[PDB]
């Protein structure tokens, strides 16, 4: 039993899919990408069950059944098949073997990241690595498999009967964002803008005084100035500032008989401290930390396969494992015990990646390359909606969280995506305290819909704006 999705290219992929679509009667009435979804899932009954349930286990079971029901038949077949294809499995795993050096900042610190908040550089490196991986393996074959780079949706149209529920979700999301989150002279910023054009002689008499002068609180006005400039003009300024300083150093060297060597070397040295410091302020911002912690679902999923020692030849068993899990929902404890008992060597290796019991801070801070029991669903949407050993079993339906993002958002179908997110939230809320969870899956799902994701296989790192500012109408 090998991987039956023998596809090594887009053309190869299209033909495999046409057969399959015809064979299985896939529709796109309620989904962006063709799927098994013949009708919007009705999760109503799970609210009443939840409300009549007393113990924690009954409640987890009710919620887990709702989530599977929500997702069972709406997997985006084309993209899931592409993500699990023989070609992408080989390239996607091999990439880690060929690029080990570029991801070492987080990969070689995996053990620490199971415990501690990541450094911002570990977050940035992971995001850049995810885009590189996508580019290098040719992951993009359509808009559903692209890296997004437009802006968040200004408006989000939902049916009138869930407007207040969506607005309540956003209030809690903004409450969370604000908990997470909780003066530069305009003339100094303008000096920096002129300096970085290559006008290095300006460094001999800045308007604030000495070139090293710190404002409040003990930080060099040059650093805060450039950092403040970068927010409006972009990262290029740092590059341009370094070039300008190198230009100065050439000048002081050419005209060395007209200059005091020691103060000329100190000024060059000191400007470089200030340019480096300007990035440490720029980079170390909570807005960049929050964007930088967003998981790239497919990238992180392939990283976990790599770390677990999965091969193209054993991959179909990972796929099968995940497929069974979304077909018949069961407890987290039972999923975890199955990894510890499986004869497959990858079982225990995947298990050792879990950070559930080791991570010492609010989970929102966890590095996006760190596995948890709840992140098994990321792998499940990539490799588990279709069992690659017998793909037609996808018709039985295997439900993984992010298949929800394949549900349409348009008004012709009245946004079954949003209806379903809301109903999951209401169900979670009936049975448990929202505010006590570090992570509310349905809120993560809304956020992602609000940034404009219409597939689980999109990367939204370069989407600009604040999703949570959307006007719900």
TrEMBL record:
One of its GO terms (molecular function) is RNA binding. InterPro entries: Nairo_nucleocap. It is found in: Virion. Keywords: Capsid protein, Helical capsid protein, Ribonucleoprotein, RNA-binding, Viral nucleoprotein, Virion. One of its GO terms (cellular component) is ribonucleoprotein complex. Its cofactor is Mn(2+). It holds the Pfam family Nairo_nucleo. The keyword Cell division does not apply. Belongs to the nairovirus nucleocapsid protein family. Probable homooligomer; forms a double superhelical polymer. Monomer. Binds dsRNA and ssRNA and probably participates in the packaging of viral genome. In the dsRNA binding mode, the nucleocapsid protein specifically binds to the vRNA panhandle secondary structure formed at the termini of viral genome. Does not discriminate between viral and nonviral RNAs through ssRNA binding mode. Displays dsDNA endonuclease activity that is sequence non-specific. This is Nucleoprotein.
